[PDB]
Amino acid sequence: ANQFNSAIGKIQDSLSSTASALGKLQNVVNQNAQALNTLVKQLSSNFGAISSVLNDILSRLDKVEAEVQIDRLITGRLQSLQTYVTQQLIRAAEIRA
Amino acid sequence: NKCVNFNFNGLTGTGVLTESNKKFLPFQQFGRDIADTTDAVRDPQTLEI
Amino acid sequence: TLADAGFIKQYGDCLGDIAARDLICAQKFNGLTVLPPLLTDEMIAQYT
Amino acid sequence: NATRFASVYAWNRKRISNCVADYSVLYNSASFSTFKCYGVSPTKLNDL
Amino acid sequence: IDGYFKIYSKHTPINLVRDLPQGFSALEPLVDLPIGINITRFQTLLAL
Ligand SMILES: *[C@@H]1O[C@H](CO)[C@@H](O)[C@H](O)[C@H]1NC(C)=O
Ligand SMILES: *[C@@H]1O[C@H](CO)[C@@H](O)[C@H](O)[C@H]1NC(C)=O
């Protein structure tokens, strides 16, 4: 009993004092956050269009001269989603395991 | 406070406009969020934010 | 430390300052959403 | 409608500012062969 | 830059005899003008 009550005591003291104890769980929250922050950061890319902003194309070009620019942003943003969903699908398998 | 199709100076978009507390310095006209999307503007006629 | 749990982002905060300091309003505003787990942090504590 | 232009070698520049531009005047003129643009489409120039 | 010249500036009181102060502050813009010239060289101006 005294050895058990002491050991359950050290569990509190260890978790309370150290920074690292939950690192395996913090690393999941961090990877989930990082990938969403990256998927947002990707939206700022031109991919070779005259703007990263969809409205700044549609407010500067006509209904034909825009389509090539917009298709660049579609291709880049769609490949950004296929990357994210591949990362998260593969990651899911790690969490399942 | 209503959803609207705004244009300021050619910065076309869609949103609810609202009164800001962001301390824009006299030289500034737009303010941006992490995503590189505008989320504040100084109105070109009456210079409130 | 949690990057949200999908709870009640009813623009009472996500309109105003916190929309500038918190990444998660920018994620929301770009069509990325976080959804709650079925079992609450109280129900997992009950099963435990 | 400047009387005499500059030579291509010594090309002139004007700063145009603090004024309203109505490019539809220029585009609605028959006078031009050439009215070609590289980061905007001419009918949109008036909306901007 | 590319057919503009511009000035950024700040004022701060400090009590250091002959050295540039440890600390941090950033310079706000004060003017821009489109002089558009081949600058190479510069000098300062002062009074008795
Ligand atoms: C233009 O805007 C100013 C404020 O910047 C306003 O005082 C003025 O009345 C406006 N001009 C006219 C002709 O009303
Ligand atoms: C500016 O003038 C100097 C001195 O004649 C010359 O060496 C330099 O190449 C010039 N640069 C430009 C951009 O005209």
Curated annotation (Swiss-Prot), chain A:
Chain positions covered by the region annotation Heptad repeat 1: 1-47
Domain of life: Viruses
Coiled-coil region(s): 26-70
UniProt function note: Subunit of the fusion protein that is processed upon entry into the host cell. Mediates fusion of the virion and cellular membranes by functioning as a class I viral fusion protein. Contains a viral fusion peptide that is unmasked after S2 cleavage. This cleavage can occur at the cell membrane by host TMPRSS2 or during endocytosis by host CSTL. In either case, this triggers an extensive and irreversible conformational change that leads to fusion of the viral envelope with the cellular cytoplasmic membrane, releasing viral genomic RNA into the host cell cytoplasm.
Protein name: Spike protein S2'
Lineage start: Viruses, Riboviria, Orthornavirae, Pisuviricota, Pisoniviricetes
Residue span relative to the full protein: 924 to 1020 of 1273
